[PDB]
């Protein structure tokens, strides 16, 4: 029995968490006794800082990191971090499914990493301990970010401080005050209870969190051909399900945040929307 350990950093009740479990279910139903999928959520096997090298070493067989986290291996997927480049997940999808988007799946092949699919999470929102109505409001704040040069620049542009931190550490980061704001999808915010330490959200939709499902090329290429081809067909099926439901899981998470009674969500006025775009679009200059 071939074992595929799939490690990720999110909660089970999320787009990625459910996708990893659906992959497990369909593989074990279609390849029972031949392939086993062992899913490790919430950084229970490896966290942000160590998963990629574990994949390269063969300690894990499948990951699905945020597109924001690949700079050490390629700078070709930085495009996905540019603020306001994609209006919505449908726009992201059009890029991902296009010839140019598909080619990025092989961007790390020379490093021994193979991209198998894109999975959606959703658009990013802003949070802080004070209201974020207009860009001036971010000045002097300390935002947690994924480990991305683009996202560092995004907050530098807003005259704020950014701090790269692993996803597992965000809650305590905000609780202790080493950071006091961040950006993320509704799903990630609610599932990790970060709304408990962030009173104010702004529905900015200013970026996204999406994933590239990846494996170790040596492992993937070493599989019997039938197993590899079948796994790829199953992955594509799972991807349709992940992507069909990611919008709903995020909307449900937003509802939970409102039902918590401890946070509020600001709807940007048209003028505020334009102001945030103007303040953030200059970061594209540095990543042509």
69 annotated among ligand-binding-site residues: yes
SS (H, E, C) the chain: CEEEEEECCCCCCCHHHHHHHHHHHHHHHHCCCCEEEEEECCCCCCCCCCHHHHHHHCCCCEECCEHHHCCCCCCCCHHHHCCCCCCCHHHHHHHHHCHHHHHHHHCCHHHCEEEEEEEEEEEEEEEECCCCCCHHHHCCCEEEECCCHHHHHHHHHCCCEEEECCHHHHHHHHHHCCCCEEEECHHHHHHCCHHHHCCEEEEEEEEEEEEEEEEEHHHHHHCCHHHHHHHHHHHHHHHHHHHHHHHHHHHHHHHHHHHHCCCEEECCCHHHHHHHHHHHHHHHHHCC
DSSP lists the bridge partners of residue 114 as 215
Domains of the chain: 2-286 (3.40.190.170)
184 annotated among ligand-binding-site residues: yes
CA distances from 148 to 71, 78, 145, 170, 226 (A): 7, 8, 7, 15, 37
142 annotated among ligand-binding-site residues: no
CA distances from 62 to 89, 181, 215, 268, 285 (A): 24, 31, 5, 38, 34
Structure tokens at 192: 């990790």
152 annotated among ligand-binding-site residues: no
Q: What are phi and psi of 94, to 5 degrees?
A: -60, -40
Burial 129-160 (b: 16+ CB within 10 A, else e): eeebeebebbeebbbbbbbbbbbbbbbebbeb
50 annotated among ligand-binding-site residues: no
What was the elucidation method? X-ray
188 annotated among ligand-binding-site residues: yes
């Amino acid at each position: 029995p071939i074992v595929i350990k799939f490690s990720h950093v999110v909660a089970e009740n999320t787009p990625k968490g459910q996708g990893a479990l659906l992959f497990k279910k369909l593989v074990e139903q279609r390849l029972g006794g031949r392939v086993e999928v062992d899913v490790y959520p919430n950084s229970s096997l490896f966290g942000d800082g160590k998963e990629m090298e574990a994949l390269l070493l063969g300690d894990v067989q499948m990951l699905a990191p945020s597109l924001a986290k690949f700079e050490q291996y390629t700078r070709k997927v930085q495009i996905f971090d540019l603020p306001f480049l994609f209006d919505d997940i449908q726009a992201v999808d059009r890029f991902q499914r296009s010839p140019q988007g598909r080619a990025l799946l092989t961007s790390m092949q020379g490093k021994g990493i193979l991209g198998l699919a894109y999975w959606h999470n959703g658009m990013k929102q802003l949070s802080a301990n004070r209201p974020l109505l207009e860009p001036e409001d971010a000045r002097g704040l300390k935002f947690r970010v994924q480990a991305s040069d683009v996202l560092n620049e995004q907050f530098r542009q807003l005259r704020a401080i950014s701090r790269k931190m692993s996803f597992a550490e965000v809650y305590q980061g905000l609780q202790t005050g080493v950071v006091n704001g961040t950006e993320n999808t509704w799903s990630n915010y609610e599932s990790q209870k970060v709304n408990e330490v962030q009173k104010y959200f702004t529905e900015s939709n200013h970026g996204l969190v999406d994933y590239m499902v990846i494996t170790n090329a040596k492992f993937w290429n070493g599989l019997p051909a039938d197993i590899r081809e079948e796994l790829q067909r199953i992955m594509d099926e799972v991807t349709v399900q992940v992507n069909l439901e990611a919008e709903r899981l995020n909307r449900d998470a937003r509802q939970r945040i409102l039902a918590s009674g401890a946070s509020e969500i600001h709807t940007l006025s048209p003028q505020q929307r334009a102001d945030w775009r103007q303040a953030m679009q200059p970061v594209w200059q540095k990543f042509r």
